[PDB]
Every structure is written in structure tokens, then in C-alpha cells.
């Protein structure tokens, strides 16, 4: 359906695990350090949880878009995972993880950018080589049950 570029990095910060988690959970400050986030368009939910939607602004690779972020994972005080969709089929993913380590915490940020807006219709054509596997597997499943 679409193509994706994913980069996950980790940095050891001299910050306590609960402090790092309280910081990554304060979405009202997310735009002040996360580069691709430029602000929110909806009031931030009272309690952030799995299934919650928020509308925000994203700037990726010279492009700006209104993105409907959907919280896909909420495991405090360890991980928050968010999936977003934008105009023109732009797809986004952000996964923030917090681990306790010697000296402080390990903050892991995984960012996934894709869609036809970012890879073009010809670059996104590389994904049609997996359609065979997917369709054959679904056909076999239907024939199985």
C-alpha cells in the first residue's frame, strides 16, 4: 500500500526514569524538542491513553501537514507509541521508550515517515512486490476456514 523509512535511536540521558517519562508524556511540550512536531490543533486529552486521537501539525522533509495522531500503545512509565495520518496519504509513526540505565535513563525514539507524499508514485511502486505474498496468504486463509 505504501512505503516507509524508519529510524530508531537511543540516547543515555542523566535524567531519572520517572522524570524522562513525565517529560515525554507532557505532550504540550512535545513540539519544543521533537523536530517533526510543530503544535497541536485539539485540546490535549485529560488522561492520555490507548485509542486517543489528537490533531497536530507535522513538518517532515520540507512539508507541513495536519496529522491525526492515534495513540497505539500506552505503557507508563515505559512506552508511548503513536500513529498519524495526513493529507495526501502521509503516514507517520512515533515510538518513545524509557529504560532505566546506569547514570540515568535511555530514551529511545523511533520515527517512521512514509506515504505517497514522501516517496512519490514511482518510488512507492516498490511495494507491489509484496502484494503477491499478501493476496496468496489471504486466499489460502479463506480456503482454510
Residues found near its own copies in the complex (CB under 8 A): 1-13, 15, 19-20, 23-24, 32-36, 60-61, 72-73, 91, 107, 109-114, 126-131, 133-142, 144-145
Using CA atoms in the order 132, 92, 7, 9, what is the torsion angle rounded to 10 degrees?
A: -140
Q: Which helix (H) or strand (E) holds 133?
A: helix 131-144
| Least distance CB 76 / its own copies (angstroms) | 14
- End-to-end Cα, the chain, rounded Å: 26
Closer residue to its own copies in complex, CB, 121/145: 145
**Contact at 8 Å (CB) between 84 and 58?**
yes
Q: How far is the CB of 64 from its own copies (least distance, A)?
A: 14
Question: Which of 10/42 has CB closer to its own copies?
Answer: 10
Among residues 43 and 133, whose Cβ is nearest to its own copies? 133
Amino acid at each position: 500500500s505504501h512505503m516507509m523509512a524508519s529510524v530508531e535511536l537511543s540516547a543515555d540521558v542523566p535524567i531519572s526514569p520517572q522524570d524522562t517519562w513525565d517529560h515525554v508524556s507532557e505532550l504540550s511540550e512535545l513540539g519544543e524538542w521533537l523536530v517533526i512536531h510543530e503544535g497541536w490543533r485539539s485540546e490535549l486529552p485529560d488522561q492520555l491513553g490507548e485509542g486517543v486521537q489528537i490533531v497536530g501539525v507535522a513538518r517532515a522533509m520540507g512539508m507541513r501537514n495536519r496529522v491525526t495522531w492515534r495513540v497505539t500503545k500506552w505503557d507508563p512509565p515505559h512506552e508511548v507509541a503513536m500513529t498519524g495520518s495526513g493529507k495526501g496519504g502521509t503516514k507517520y509513526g512515533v515510538t518513545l521508550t524509557v529504560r532505566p540505565t546506569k547514570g540515568g535513563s535511555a530514551l529511545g525514539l523511533r520515527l517512521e515517515l512514509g506515504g505517497r507524499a514522501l516517496f512519490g508514485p514511482l518510488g512507492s511502486a516498490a511495494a507491489r512486490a509484496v502484494k503477491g505474498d499478501v493476496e496468496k496468504s489471504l486466499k489460502q486463509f479463506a480456503e482454510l476456514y
